[PDB]
Nucleic acid binder design. Structure first.
Ligand SMILES: C[C@H]1COc2c(N3CC[C@@H](C4(N)CC4)C3)c(F)cc3cc(C(=O)O)c(=O)n1c23
Ligand SMILES: C[C@H]1COc2c(N3CC[C@@H](C4(N)CC4)C3)c(F)cc3cc(C(=O)O)c(=O)n1c23
Ligand SMILES: [Mg+2]
Ligand SMILES: [Mg+2]
Lengths: 706, 631
DNA sequence: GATCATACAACGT
DNA sequence: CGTTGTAT
DNA sequence: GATCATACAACGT
DNA sequence: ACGTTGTAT
């Protein structure tokens, strides 16, 4: 046990359930050991709603809580409750709420008596800590608390504001005054009313009910349209789990239709390009990579992010990897056999350019980061539909995503043929887009028509099957389905023999080596053994044939999650691509203009170098003089003053005139594409085919259409 | 069994077990091994020294116990029939302390498995380094194959104790791994201080590999440098925090990002090992003069190791650090490339005060240790100045100013005056403190000491001798001198040797500034010549083919001056921008003579050092906290 | 530096 | 016997 | 994102 | 009921 307390005043004693261990150690160093205890909650706790009393006591985290609380699971007896006020403090994440949401599930589904009397309490942690000299101010919301603290800035000096993104970042004494010391402590008393007792149980049910996931989908669809001291648990539970359910659906687990990436994925790819680790740069240690991702853009777990960067670098997890690394990046038999970040070096892959090349052409928005010191892109200018090329498989609260990867050349031609005939129907797209293209050579056996349903309804499943020959009578598997381990498939096919379920099999051998990636041999006892029939069993028994559910749920351009079909995904991406190039063009035009405007100002100086130099020496501020005596603009005048004497030579005049001829022609070409909607398309129809030419490859997974 | 990845075969004549050093290195060694006849077993961290451990104690260590179970033979058991593998090969990282992991493995294969190494079953794998240094855990799995696993291109040796070198293999290994025979290893270092063989001698490899580690730790891990008073793990952190812009005025940065840069750039060692060091610098109650400031939970006096993860804590350099880095940009110290050879790191740091005695250090090398207590700032400063003004000052005269140590606590030092006179005259000894708590003394540890006394003015006297109220502190003034070798020095020797370093780093600072001023003045001439004749310069630039030689011939300016002129901007032609140029000329002319006068006159040199050691102690002057009187 | 138990949707055995 | 701070 | 165990010197119990 | 799948504490 980690909780200690001296006094035994059932009305004064007080328990605090901190979220983190790092936070627990700080909360214990500053707590009042006289009548206050503290016990950390390593990681997230069990969802004790639909768990049996025997199971609640079988989970470490909930167990210790049940012992420290004093009461037994589902025991309406509080005669030996060690502490009076059982407080639950967690950090102000969307995550901590979830931690606070399921602690209520524990203190409700089992310890109903504890909350009925009103002993469950939630602490209000501070958001910001603004200070100026002998003045300390804490905030809970930047709209009301932080706004006033900064508004009353009529005192000398520049205030300092520390953004506490989590209680782990707080100092012991700095945490004592905010949530521990009752004087300066903010804390609300969670209570379940007697009249609202029927609703407090109904709300928490659909929120934490494993089976009522469909109800939550309709719940979030309704609460999203109209989204705008003692607290009632009825109110708390619904508001806390909503701020989480949305947070996960948006900023953790579901990707964006445009760039086909997740925020942890995006912030990782950008932070590598920003660190200079493009496809050509020499590899950099994965540590600094993840140090920058978390240190600047993604305030979450170190190990959790590097796990995402591993999958982006594995040629067998992604179809078109985004990262190339040096070191032990795992093996097909187990993707998680990978080395630490401190040992593995990484960089961006050639395919990553399709997401980053157009980043400097004002083709994307930009939102501040969590601390506000830097600037990160809200999305990335994808030049091909990455959402379909690599796919994703996520799990949000109320919904999930399962998008299989597809071939690059097959999607590109589908994008080209959809702008040449905007009336293209789905059946016409399937004549080119043939189906999922996994990073394996296993045949997709799902029927062609069954695929049409999957790409019209946005849901369904496809099944893969391994490839094999009968060299020398023995069967030899040559390639396995996606995400199927050879060691696992062999162990399954081996444990059967021990269970006497395959008395016709002689031996099983794994001949995988450098030349042959995955060679699995299966020898029968007699040549007269119907290995053709033996296999039809192993497909329906082992992982030699694995199904794959498809759920094309994604954040659409409209900022909302939705299940698109193949046509809606491509049609809606071309809206995204046609709009970024539109922005990519106007951006260059905006700079060509401003250049030609500088240049024409320079030529005026050359044609009047005598007067200019005379005005510079015979005037206090030359810029106003140069504008009245020549008609030039202030922006043009500044450039004149910045001309170096080197530039007054004749050659540099010829260079300036050289640009203005080149740029003048460039200016007209841009104005033409932007103005002509047909020229605009001809550009897209060209850039897409060009990208496929330099990044497309042959189809890995055949569809078994002979 | 254990985590050892066994092979499919069982032939005692063709099986082999590889004991890798790193677990991540073992994960890659398991992908690339031939699953038929090759088997690996990881060895997390360093193993226990079983040279002194008993037969039953050998089986207690979980690492050594698994090695025994995997090997087959039991500790000190004569029966060799139980041998699950034929070749017992060890694969350690080319790290110096990787050769230490190998030596410790030999201590068991000889003291407890003598018949195993005698029969010629202990083998050594020679790891190549070339691709960068490419550590074992860092290289590619397939790359690790062709270097240590694939027998075709594998480089391994056969360790065997010769019958003639048997008595020597035992006597040599003894003093190397004898916890008590530490003084013998000190004398061994003094007397002892690409070609390879296909079968080396265990006795010859035991004394060779343990000497590398014995020297690597004494130099690059444990002992500090006399000048900056820092170890490499400490020096690299300071530099990397400045190169990242974490100055005194900058905002705090997450320590995780800071440590990450220290490792990937300069310091190829443990991550928690680096963060633990940086906290020893940031805690105000471990260093008297901290080098790091931070936000969050940086420990508490009751338990320094109760601190928050590097991911939650954020830190920056402190004001006191400026004494080590202010003069780093004036070419004052030497520079050596980093370990991978892509960046450069400083060899020394331009210390403006003798940090070796201000903060002190506490290290444990091989054969020798280090115990330097911290000292007062205004005292070590007032001593250095008085040593310059009177080079013939004696330690007794020095003790009149430097009263003794200065610990970060108000507890009084009860050591006698004559006892301290022996500390600073011999370079060794101890010192004692008494509560009013002492340095490094926990408030919870002493209470439990007095509480156990309860279960089973004069009262305080008995509590000082029983509880931790009265503690002792060892003192050993060992350090790497400017001569690049370890040596124990005293106060009158340490201060004198430091002022040789300070009088050299400042001399380099002066000549570095002198070299820059003369270069600027040379430019300012060609510029003033242009303002005096700008009318011609413009005509020469617009009416001549190539102005660079033309401006040189006419005006007698040099190649560099004519280039500066061409780089003038039209706004630099107004009257002001010439007054601004005549301002430097008259300003830098004053400095060009002061420096030359301060560098050519050894008397003006000392006046600067004396004036600089005094002005620097002003802003950085904190009166001491620990009283000092006999008791 | 490598173990570890959780949430979450929802399809397969 | 346990102390200290860098190391695997 | 906390936790385990080792080295190594030499003084204090 | 079990086992995934992949970003989170
Ligand atoms: C929240 C902390 C600590 O708990 C974690 C895990 N456990 C295993 C034991 C279990 C427990 N409640 C009994 C102690 C929680 C775990 F398996 C993985 C992580 C990964 C990360 C990270 O990626 O940063 C991380 O921070 N934590 C983790
Ligand atoms: C060398 C590696 C792995 O082994 C380590 C430890 N153990 C756990 C018990 C002990 C053993 N003989 C039973 C296996 C070794 C340990 F306790 C700490 C670290 C810390 C760091 C680091 O700071 O990086 C580190 O790298 N390692 C560590
Ligand atoms: Mg948080
Ligand atoms: Mg190494």
């Amino acid at each position: 046990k980690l909780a200690d307390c001296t006094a035994q005043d059932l009305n004064r004693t007080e328990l605090f359930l901190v979220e983190g261990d790092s936070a627990g150690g700080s909360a214990k160093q500053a707590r009042d050991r006289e009548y206050q205890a503290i016990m950390p909650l390593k990681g997230k706790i069990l969802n004790t709603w639909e768990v049996s009393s025997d199971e609640v006591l079988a989970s470490q985290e909930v167990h210790d809580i049940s012992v420290a609380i004093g009461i037994d699971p589902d025991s309406d007896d509080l005669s030996q409750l060690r502490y009076g006020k059982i407080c639950i403090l967690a950090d102000a994440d969307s995550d901590g709420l979830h931690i606070a949401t399921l602690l209520c599930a524990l203190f409700v589904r089992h310890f109903r008596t504890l909350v009925k009397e009103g002993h469950v309490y939630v602490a209000l942690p501070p958001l910001y800590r603004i200070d100026l000299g002998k003045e300390v101010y804490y905030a809970l919301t930047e709209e009301e608390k932080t706004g006033v603290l900064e508004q009353l800035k009529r005192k000398k000096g520049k205030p300092n504001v520390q953004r506490f993104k989590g209680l782990g970042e707080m100092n012991p004494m700095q945490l004592r005054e905010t949530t521990l010391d009752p004087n300066t402590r903010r804390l609300v008393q969670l209570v379940i009313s007697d009249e609202d007792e029927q609703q407090t149980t109904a709300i928490m049910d659909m929120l934490l009910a494993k089976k009522r996931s469909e109800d939550r989908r309709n719940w979030l669809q309704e609460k999203g349209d109209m989204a705008d001291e003692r607290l009632a648990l009825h109110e708390f539970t619904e508001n806390a789990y909503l701020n989480y359910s949305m947070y996960v659906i948006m900023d953790r687990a579901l990707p964006f239709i445009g760039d086909g990436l997740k925020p942890v994925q995006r912030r990782i790819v950008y932070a590598m390009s920003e660190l200079g680790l493009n496809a050509s740069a020499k590899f950099k240690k994965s540590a600094r990579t993840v140090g920058d991702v978390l240190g600047k853009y993604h305030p979450h777990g170190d190990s959790a992010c590097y796990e995402a960067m591993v999958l982006m670098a594995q040629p067998f997890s992604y179809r078109y990897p985004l990262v190339d690394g040096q070191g032990n990046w795992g093996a097909p038999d187990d993707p998680k056999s990978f080395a630490a970040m401190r040992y593995t070096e990484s960089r961006l892959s050639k395919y990553a350019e399709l997401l980053l090349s157009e980043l400097g052409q004002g083709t994307v928005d930009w939102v501040p980061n969590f601390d506000g010191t830097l600037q990160e892109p809200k999305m990335l200018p994808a030049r091909l539909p990455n959402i379909l090329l690599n796919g994703t498989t996520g799990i949000a609260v109320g919904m999930a995503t399962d998008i299989p990867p597809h071939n690059l050349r097959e999607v590109a031609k589908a994008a080209i043929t959809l702008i040449e005939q905007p009336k293209t129907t789905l059946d016409e797209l399937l004549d080119i887009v043939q189906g999922p293209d996994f990073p394996t050579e296993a045949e997709i056996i799902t029927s062609r028509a069954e695929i049409r349903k999957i790409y019209q309804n946005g849901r369904g499943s496809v099944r893969m099957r391994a490839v094999w020959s009968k060299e020398d009578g023995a069967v030899v598997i040559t390639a396995l389905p996606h995400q199927v381990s050879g060691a696992k498939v062999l162990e399954q096919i081996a444990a059967q023999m021990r269970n006497k379920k395959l008395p016709m099999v002689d031996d099983l051998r794994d001949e995988s080596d450098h030349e042959n990636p995955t060679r699995l041999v299966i020898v029968p006892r007699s040549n007269r053994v119907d290995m053709e029939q033996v296999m039809n069993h192993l497909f329906a028994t082992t992982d030699l044939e694995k199904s794959y559910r498809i759920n094309l749920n994604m954040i659409g351009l409209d900022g909302r999650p939705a299940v698109k079909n193949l046509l809606e995904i491509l049609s809606e991406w071309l809206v995204f691509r046609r709009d970024t190039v539109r922005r990519r063009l106007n951006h260059r035009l905006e700079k060509v203009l401003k250049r030609l405007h500088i240049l024409e100002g320079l030529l005026v100086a050359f044609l009047n170098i005598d007067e200019v130099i005379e005005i510079i020496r015979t005037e206090d501020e030359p810029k106003p003089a140069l504008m009245s005596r020549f008609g030039i603009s202030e922006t043009q005048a500044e450039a004149i003053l910045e001309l170096k004497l080197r530039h007054l030579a004749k050659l540099e005049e010829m260079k300036i005139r050289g640009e203005q001829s080149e740029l003048e022609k460039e200016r007209d070409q841009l104005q033409a594409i932007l103005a002509s909607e047909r020229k605009m398309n001809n550009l897209l129809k060209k850039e897409l085919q060009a990208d496929a030419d330099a990044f497309g490859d042959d189809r890995r997974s055949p569809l078994h259409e002979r």
